[PDB]
Scaffold this active site. Sequence first.
Site, PDB file in Angstrom:
ATOM      1  N   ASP A  54       0.832  -1.191   0.000  1.00 18.89           N
ATOM      2  CA  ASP A  54       0.000   0.000   0.000  1.00 18.89           C
ATOM      3  C   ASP A  54       0.880   1.260   0.000  1.00 18.89           C
ATOM      4  O   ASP A  54       0.842   2.070   0.928  1.00 18.89           O
ATOM      5  CB  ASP A  54      -0.907  -0.022   1.231  1.00 18.89           C
ATOM      6  CG  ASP A  54      -1.772   1.199   1.337  1.00 18.89           C
ATOM      7  OD1 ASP A  54      -2.318   1.429   2.430  1.00 18.89           O
ATOM      8  OD2 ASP A  54      -1.917   1.924   0.337  1.00 18.89           O
ATOM      9  N   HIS A 177      -5.302   9.882  13.217  1.00 20.67           N
ATOM     10  CA  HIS A 177      -4.866   8.519  13.384  1.00 20.67           C
ATOM     11  C   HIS A 177      -3.798   8.364  14.455  1.00 20.67           C
ATOM     12  O   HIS A 177      -3.046   9.295  14.710  1.00 20.67           O
ATOM     13  CB  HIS A 177      -4.363   8.036  12.022  1.00 20.67           C
ATOM     14  CG  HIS A 177      -4.319   6.548  11.880  1.00 20.67           C
ATOM     15  ND1 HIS A 177      -5.211   5.713  12.522  1.00 20.67           N
ATOM     16  CD2 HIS A 177      -3.506   5.746  11.149  1.00 20.67           C
ATOM     17  CE1 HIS A 177      -4.945   4.460  12.196  1.00 20.67           C
ATOM     18  NE2 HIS A 177      -3.918   4.453  11.364  1.00 20.67           N
TER      19      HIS A 177
END
Lengths: 281, 281, 281, 281
Positions: A54, A177
């Site tokens: 990713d 996050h």
Amino acid sequence: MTKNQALRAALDSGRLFTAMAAHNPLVAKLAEQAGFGGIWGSGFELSASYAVPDANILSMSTHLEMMRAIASTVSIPLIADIDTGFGNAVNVHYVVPQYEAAGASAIVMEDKTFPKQELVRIEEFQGKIAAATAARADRDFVVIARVEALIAGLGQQEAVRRGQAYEEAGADAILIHSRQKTPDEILAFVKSWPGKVPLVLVPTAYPQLTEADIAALSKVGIVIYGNHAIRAAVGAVREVFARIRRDGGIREVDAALPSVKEIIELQGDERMRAVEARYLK
Amino acid sequence: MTKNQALRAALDSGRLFTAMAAHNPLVAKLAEQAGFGGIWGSGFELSASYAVPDANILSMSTHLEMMRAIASTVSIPLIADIDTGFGNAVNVHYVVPQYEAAGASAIVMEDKTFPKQELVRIEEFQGKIAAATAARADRDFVVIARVEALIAGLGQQEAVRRGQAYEEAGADAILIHSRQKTPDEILAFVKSWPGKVPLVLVPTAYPQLTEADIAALSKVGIVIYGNHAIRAAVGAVREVFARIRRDGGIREVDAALPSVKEIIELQGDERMRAVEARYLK
Amino acid sequence: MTKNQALRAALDSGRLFTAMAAHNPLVAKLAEQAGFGGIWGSGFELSASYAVPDANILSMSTHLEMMRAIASTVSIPLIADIDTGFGNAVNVHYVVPQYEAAGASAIVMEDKTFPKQELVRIEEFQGKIAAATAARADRDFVVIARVEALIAGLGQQEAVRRGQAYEEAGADAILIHSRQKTPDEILAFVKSWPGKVPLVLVPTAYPQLTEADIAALSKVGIVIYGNHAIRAAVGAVREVFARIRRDGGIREVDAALPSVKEIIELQGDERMRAVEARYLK
Amino acid sequence: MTKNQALRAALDSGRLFTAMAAHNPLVAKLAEQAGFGGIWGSGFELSASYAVPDANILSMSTHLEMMRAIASTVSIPLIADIDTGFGNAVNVHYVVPQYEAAGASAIVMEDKTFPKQELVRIEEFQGKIAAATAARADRDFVVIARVEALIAGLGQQEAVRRGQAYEEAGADAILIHSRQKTPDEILAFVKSWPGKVPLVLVPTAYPQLTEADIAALSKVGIVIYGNHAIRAAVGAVREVFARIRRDGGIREVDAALPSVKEIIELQGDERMRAVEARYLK
Ligand SMILES: [Cl-]
Ligand SMILES: [Cl-]
Ligand SMILES: [Cl-]
Ligand SMILES: [Cl-]
Ligand code: NA
Ligand code: NA
Ligand code: NA
Ligand code: NA
């Protein structure tokens, strides 16, 4: 209500909106049927389903068409992961409208640099966010800024300054996050968040934090399950491939599987039967 | 050995080649790791993963790119489902070379008409098969003719006449399919099959027929598991979405899932670490 | 000779290789018929044919599929414009193999940063170049480094240091570009170029520099016509659309156009007639 | 007015609507600038630009994305050529909505069979047309039935019976095509056409028939220029490639070409300058 209104309506209303990850339309459909508020068009999940890291390896059009595929499959809102915008404000300006046109009701973009300062400058991202809100056609389309400062280790002070800077640039919501295996860092942030817009959590690393615990946090407007779809899939396909090769067949394993008829029903066979019935002449 | 040789070598050698269905590269990778001989690029599975009926709804290029995606992911041979060729011999001629170029080691085409005679004429399909063998660049690429006569209810006599007609047109192998919930029809065919080429089974409806039972059939060269990948996936994602919405979170369910690290490893993180290490400067 | 060998053979042999721009397969075919040595899969031309600025707006997969489309159409080598690699060395590593697989015989990458230091650091690009040469499967595939230092205004000294640094990282050829409306800057560079590999010119801004003038330059191995295809097309379609709307029809303009039969011949009708003739049964 | 209304408004109003062919967005943009009423998303032109016969070789998604690309580029209505629907009524039902979503304001489908009765049965096509009108979301989207009976040599009586049958199935307009090198056949049809909906002409073979001659025909609502874009392009690129290889350079030819600045302006540089100016921070 259009999908964009459904989403916006959840944010303004104060409920907690739940979004589930999905790497293909069928999976997204199942999430809808399970009752989530919306789908999460995860870059991680899709690149994972393609066996690629990713790290912006998957083509941007690969993600875009999957989002188009999913939005045309489900009736609930879709939040698209567009990473860092695929470039700068110019790229963001040309990109956002394509996602909005694919059918997404929101997009998530992060202030990390591309490619591997861990982050881009505050004013630079503010600009990328303003470019996003300007590029959108329907004011309901939601733009979510994602602050990666905690992950960066720049600190809480800097994370809130970014979230606030992004909010002033026009961000409708802030995804913050955290790395920590404990939701201490995240909670600390929530508590000190002064901004006026809703916060977004993706509590993947701290699974002890329930929807009840997050609902308790008035400031969090959306909860996102980031990678359970692909994990659920991997765990089961792996086990079934092991049983078939250990049993030398599918005599034992067939019983424990959804039937083929069940897959045909999920494909939309009913709609197809009506079409064949009324138009195949 | 190239993938085409690996496949051809299995057919000439007499072993039983096992092929597992796959609707995306990760799933195909897992099948490889579980030890199947090859992957099955199923039209049913892919259209299913897209929540669309398997009636030639999915674009032909949608299947083609998925095949390209998978062949570049696995090291074992890939058999592509190209349905009825997307048209006539002309279409077949232009199509086959694209699949061969995507990386498939074989293609499967059926003598059913498009769109919904249930079948096309014998001479017509012979022609579509000859066009396929002519269009291929590497003589190792395998062309498999799929006889749908049993499914049609035309009978055994006609099924064998088609299989034999296709073999004379140049088909390297014959896929013969059956409806019956008992493998009586299929076996009957195998026993009376006089043709010189290997047979292919997709025993999805008669799961009592093991690889040992099929290995016993000297005439069958390949066994194909047609839709267990998508079924395994549906069954598990569905259950996990139900638990999350019943538990109101993923505190109970997270433990039973493959970890996120496991998904990163399947994405090819190792290869990426080496690249970053030696070239990211 | 494979396309990669044809190209490599031209570089080692010392001839001057001519490459023409092309924004679609038909145009590329026409260039082949006109006698160029190879095709130039220009990012500018393609983004232009899409009415979008050439600032990495077009999806990377959009360019990749066009390259696949063209390589499968022409028999001469194709040089793909991959801009700055779509990221860093990691991105370059995953990308290059896809272009090589689409059928390109070379790729061109520039040391400019992404997105809008005008350039990346020398060691960083060296790394992106090494990642490219490592990622390729066939050693014949050519990797061309593009030095944008002159355009940057960093100077000649720095341009040659980059070209030499890239050559040591493994670059097979160096594309050196210049702004000036006079080919003074470019020539100066050529004359002082000490590196062992061939140079590449794209003399678009200084059209007074003929192939004879460039052939005179022993150090230049390839000449590239960067945007005449799209310009030729724009100029003519524009004029023909003006005549039709001024004449209120196509009675005057039809005569001056290639016939429809001519377009069918360029589509490969002959090949199709043979196929229909021998396989449509 | 939405594009669908603009189109519908032209049909109801009685003006003659002019549509120009286009094989890419830039070309479509130029047509818009030249003043046509709409664009023609020709299957012939696109397959031609790909150097492939116009026999359903190009993937259906290839045409669909080009239509999406063009509709997002121009502000005038786009009429998409979807050939015979890519299958039967079922295929038509799933297809039409994708074209409507790409942004087309109308679609054209013909009653020819797929693949190479030259035509499908009347009732069968009526059904494919009803499936189209049912599948559309906005009632303004136009559905045009294309009668190929004249081309078939079935006669005038049968051509009008089809056009009338299609009109009763819900077709908004009828495209009637003719082979003859003289517009005698076409005119004869127009004169005897009793149906209530507007007719469509694509007078490619009889270029003596001007817009004035067609405007004279009250029954014709739309005129379509079927392949002049690709022909104009081929004629000019071919000549310019010949001059470059005959002159051994582009010193003589550069002067006669649109400048590079002109191509940048057509790419939408102005919009990009504003974006960079207000958001690139
Ligand atoms: Cl998938
Ligand atoms: Cl997929
Ligand atoms: Cl084009
Ligand atoms: Cl194109
Ligand atoms: Na996927
Ligand atoms: Na899939
Ligand atoms: Na193009
Ligand atoms: Na084109």
